[PDB]
Design a protein around this ligand. Structure first.
Ligand SMILES: *[C@@H]1O[C@H](CO)[C@@H](O[C@@H]2O[C@H](CO)[C@@H](O[C@@H]3O[C@H](CO[C@H]4O[C@H](CO)[C@@H](O)[C@H](O)[C@@H]4O)[C@@H](O)[C@H](O)[C@@H]3O)[C@H](O)[C@H]2NC(C)=O)[C@H](O)[C@H]1NC(C)=O
Ligand SMILES: *[C@@H]1O[C@H](CO)[C@@H](O[C@@H]2O[C@H](CO)[C@@H](O)[C@H](O)[C@H]2NC(C)=O)[C@H](O)[C@H]1NC(C)=O
Ligand SMILES: *[C@@H]1O[C@H](CO)[C@@H](O[C@@H]2O[C@H](CO)[C@@H](O)[C@H](O)[C@H]2NC(C)=O)[C@H](O)[C@H]1NC(C)=O
Ligand SMILES: *[C@@H]1O[C@H](CO)[C@@H](O[C@@H]2O[C@H](CO)[C@@H](O)[C@H](O)[C@H]2NC(C)=O)[C@H](O)[C@H]1NC(C)=O
Ligand SMILES: *[C@@H]1O[C@H](CO)[C@@H](O)[C@H](O)[C@H]1NC(C)=O
Ligand SMILES: *[C@@H]1O[C@H](CO)[C@@H](O)[C@H](O)[C@H]1NC(C)=O
Ligand SMILES: *[C@@H]1O[C@H](CO)[C@@H](O)[C@H](O)[C@H]1NC(C)=O
Ligand SMILES: *[C@@H]1O[C@H](CO)[C@@H](O)[C@H](O)[C@H]1NC(C)=O
Ligand SMILES: *[C@@H]1O[C@H](CO)[C@@H](O)[C@H](O)[C@H]1NC(C)=O
Ligand SMILES: *[C@@H]1O[C@H](CO)[C@@H](O)[C@H](O)[C@H]1NC(C)=O
Lengths: 132, 462, 132, 132
């Protein structure tokens, strides 16, 4: 299953491994999200969607922070209503797919926390560089 | 000391690649004429000014015959020609039995025109009207199953129905600039008197070429860009007789051509909302279609091309000669002056043999000696040897005159055990590619390929 | 030859200068990588390849480090089998195009090293942020 | 008028608020510049122009600094020939649209200053990481 030369080159191949183990492999997915008569319209439409998908992901990561980091901390605390598990279940027992079946509920609450968390930081940094 | 990888973006390095170039106009046509001018409707309105960048200490391996961009010109040309014919009148109703007689009997100068009549379908499907036109003998062929009568047809009814070329379309060779798409660049030689292959020592980028006229012709080129300092002779391999020799000129010989007899155009209704056009009458005199070249300047050019071509065949005498034989499309020089497809006999033009003395036999006194060529005309052209590419060119009223600078000669060598002191050079039935290749030899396309990696003795912050 | 307004606006125009002297011009190439019936399909196909070319480069720069930096150090040592020149030849004698003729051998070895250097660094920073 | 859920989701909704108070809304525009037979050609040309518009801004911010930051400082002093106003007029009186009417003059002076400001920073960091 896992193998950094191909696991996500056909995509997905670590999906059974549990979340802690899968975290070493993420690069192989990212580096493949952007590989490459009426049939010409069909191909152009497939390409152009693959580009806009990829860019809308990078746009969100920019706005929340972090613009290229694959993994980052974010100064939003985890609310008790989502805290329904011990950390050791999440990182050592569930798969990423089985975890998604939970936080696919209410994800936009977390995006509203992440976006606003960055604003207050960038305002705060501007006031420090305003004394640098 | 120790060494560490550093990654650099934007570094100038490159590779050969095949990529679809795009065509850029001089924008002058972009009134109504963008869609009238053949070889412009596919292209951008632009000011594609060739850029300034001599590359310095670079040396680069150019090639003229292995080049791909010539096939992009060829495919773009055919795909655009064939596109511009789709909306125009198919002559399918006109494959009737023609009945003909001579326009005024007599010599080939007038008997070139048959006078022919036939029944045409009006708009009213049940009514046919008797109608007449003048046709040049090459457009016409005798109908068989008859005792050598006045029964005839158009030449193409047994192969393909030609479209009339829409009369708004203009075939005039307005120049194309070819441009590299983003993330590619075009290199050219500035190192003139180049050989067609090997390293070029003085090189520039440009995003777009100079203005290249898409002139189609054979046995001569016309309105080509002149060589810089000297006559330049190019071939893929001289030692194989099958290779063309492009004799690129330093100086413009000038040609004049004409159909001096005065045609008039008539329109024939065919079904709902279409008109065929035909030559209705010749006003006054019948005098022949012909072309004129100053035989003084032509003779000096056959001396100078003699001198240069002898360097590759040293001490030997040079025979020029006529083409070996075939159809008009093979044996005759060809044009589209004014919109008429001429076919001129070059047999007397490439005449005589000239030798390592290369004396200035033309005296410094005045002379008016003109060589003159007989020229046929055709209206039905099976363009670029495509049976489905064929078209009927509508005739043009009045009288055509047409003037031009000339050539890079398309010669072929002819030689074997006969040779000893001398070899024969003949006009060649060139491909369309050979015209464009005599302009594009200067140019090569490369893919920029940045993201370079090097050792620098530096370490990441942690 | 070289002028910072246009040298890479027709691309390439510094390529004779030797590697150290070329390194002040890189921005002019970067900013030019992305300028602008069946001909409609020709232009669309040409444009969409020029976008994917650019994004696939920016993605590689993301994954190795550094996210947009034009020039950066990497914590991958330079192997003895590649070490065939003194540094001054590279920076002060060779042209970038000439150096490519060497390191066009074995390139994907370097990319494999560069990718994995970043994985181990993000694992390490994540524990420092977990203590912090 | 202003509302960070929708103000720039149909774009422009803050445009009268004065320059200081608009600075809290930029994310709503940044997240929306990339939302998404001859008619197929009209749509493909609409899409691919919107991508090229977006990437060209990201390339410029990448070259001047800052790589994805929405707001940042730049080590170009503000010249007296542009300094025709006190800071309070700028941040507390004009709108961004009113401001554009001034600094739409001479804008490419500023982009020349910004690009070279970054070159000299990256050179100076390279020496320090060579000593590190
Ligand atoms: C080599 O280059 C020479 C110099 O450019 C070429 O000579 C020129 O050839 C063109 C051929 O058309 C002549 O242009 C003319 O255009 C006027 C106006 O055209 C408009 O009106 C006509 C109706 O009269 C209409 O059919 C058109 O669509 C246009 O809307 C015509 O009235 C003239 O009759 C004439 O054809 C140039 O005058 C001519 N210049 C010279 C100095 O002779 C030469 O053709 C090139 N060689 C080859 C083989 O193409
Ligand atoms: C070429 O043929 C045309 C068409 O017949 C001639 O044009 C006519 O000339 C006469 C005399 O000048 C005029 O009265 C007519 O009005 C003209 N037009 C038409 C449509 O008939 C033209 O003169 C001829 N030119 C030459 C040199 O032969
Ligand atoms: C130009 O080429 C033609 C055709 O190859 C040459 O014509 C032949 O010349 C010889 C002379 O002995 C005749 O026996 C043949 O009958 C000719 N015709 C053919 C079809 O072979 C001609 O000699 C060449 N011109 C010159 C001046 O050398
Ligand atoms: C149509 O034919 C006339 C007559 O041949 C052309 O006018 C002449 O051009 C020749 C060559 O330049 C001169 O020798 C004659 O002296 C001219 N004659 C006159 C009366 O001017 C005319 O140019 C041709 N028309 C077109 C449209 O090509
Ligand atoms: C051509 O033939 C037709 C036959 O009806 C005749 O009327 C006409 O005068 C002829 N025209 C010429 C110029 O020969
Ligand atoms: C078409 O007809 C002419 C009649 O002379 C003949 O020469 C030609 O070979 C024919 N072509 C075909 C494909 O029948
Ligand atoms: C010059 O051109 C010919 C014909 O293309 C080629 O065979 C020959 O090798 C070239 N020679 C040099 C010195 O470039
Ligand atoms: C060419 O001619 C010169 C002068 O007549 C002579 O010296 C030389 O040997 C000849 N070379 C050949 C290849 O015939
Ligand atoms: C060209 O003209 C000559 C006479 O000058 C004639 O014998 C020959 O058949 C013609 N050739 C062509 C190909 O038209
Ligand atoms: C022919 O060449 C000369 C070269 O000086 C040029 O002046 C002239 O305009 C050219 N004419 C044509 C029709 O190309």
């Amino acid at each position: 299953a896992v193998g950094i030369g191909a696991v996500f080159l056909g995509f997905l191949g670590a999906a059974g491994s549990t979340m802690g183990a899968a975290s070493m492999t993420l690069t192989v997915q990212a580096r493949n999200l952007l590989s490459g008569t009426v049939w010409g319209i069909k191909q152009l439409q497939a390409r152009v969607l693959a580009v806009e998908r990829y860019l809308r992901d990078q746009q969100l990561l920019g706005i929340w922070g972090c613009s290229g980091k694959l993994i980052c901390c974010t100064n939003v605390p985890w609310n008790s209503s989502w805290s329904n598990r011990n950390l050791s279940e999440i990182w050592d027992n569930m798969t990423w797919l089985q975890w998604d079946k939970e936080i696919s509920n209410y994800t936009q609450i977390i995006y509203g926390l992440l976006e606003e968390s960055q604003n207050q930081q960038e305002k705060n940094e501007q006031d420090l560089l305003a004394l640098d | 000391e120790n060494l560490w990888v550093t990654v650099y973006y934007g570094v100038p390095v490159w590779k050969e690649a095949k990529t679809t170039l795009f065509c850029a106009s001089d924008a002058r046509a972009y009134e109504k004429e963008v869609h009238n001018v053949w070889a412009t409707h596919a292209c951008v309105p632009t000011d594609p000014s060739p850029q300034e960048l001599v590359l310095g200490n670079v040396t680069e391996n150019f090639n003229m015959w292995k080049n791909d961009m010539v096939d992009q010109m060829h495919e773009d040309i055919i795909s655009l020609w064939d596109q511009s014919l789709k909306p125009c009148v198919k002559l399918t109703p006109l494959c009737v039995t023609l009945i003909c007689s001579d326009a005024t009997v007599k010599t080939g100068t007038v008997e070139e025109m048959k006078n022919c009549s036939f029944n045409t379908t009006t708009e009213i499907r049940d009514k046919e009207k008797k109608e007449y036109a003048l046709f040049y003998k090459p457009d016409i062929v005798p109908l068989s199953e008859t005792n050598n009568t006045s029964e005839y047809r158009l030449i193409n009814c047994n192969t393909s129905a030609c479209t009339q070329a829409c009369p708004k379309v203009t075939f005039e060779p307005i120049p194309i600039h070819y441009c590299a798409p983003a993330g590619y660049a075009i290199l050219k030689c500035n190192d003139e008197t180049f050989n067609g292959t090997g390293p070029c020592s003085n090189v520039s980028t440009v995003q777009c070429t100079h203005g290249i006229r898409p002139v189609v012709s054979t046995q001569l080129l016309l309105n080509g860009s002149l060589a810089e300092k000297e006559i330049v002779i190019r071939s893929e391999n001289l030692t194989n007789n099958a290779k063309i020799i492009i004799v690129h000129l330093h100086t413009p010989v000038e040609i004049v051509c004409t159909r001096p007899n005065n045609n008039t155009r008539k329109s024939v209704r065919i079904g709902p909302g279409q008109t065929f056009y035909a030559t209705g009458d010749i006003i006054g005199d019948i005098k022949q279609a012909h072309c004129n070249i100053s035989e003084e300047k032509w003779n000096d050019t056959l001396q100078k091309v003699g001198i240069e071509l002898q360097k590759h065949f040293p001490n030997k005498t040079i025979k020029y000669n006529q083409s070996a034989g075939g159809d008009m499309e093979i044996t005759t020089h060809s044009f589209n002056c004014g919109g008429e497809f001429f076919y001129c006999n070059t047999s007397n033009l490439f005449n005589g043999t000239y030798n390592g003395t290369y004396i200035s036999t033309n005296s410094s006194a005045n002379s008016t000696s003109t060589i003159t060529l007989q020229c046929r005309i055709k209206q039905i052209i099976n363009m670029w040897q495509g049976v489905g590419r064929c078209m009927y060119a509508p005739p043009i009223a009045g009288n055509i005159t047409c003037r031009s600078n000339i050539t890079g000669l398309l010669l072929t060598r002819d030689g074997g055990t006969n040779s000893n002191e001398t070899e024969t050079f003949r006009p060649a039935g060139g491909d369309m590619r050979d015209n464009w290749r005599s302009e594009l030899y200067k140019y090569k396309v490369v893919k920029i390929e940045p993201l370079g990696v090097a050792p620098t003795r530096c370490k990441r912050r942690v």
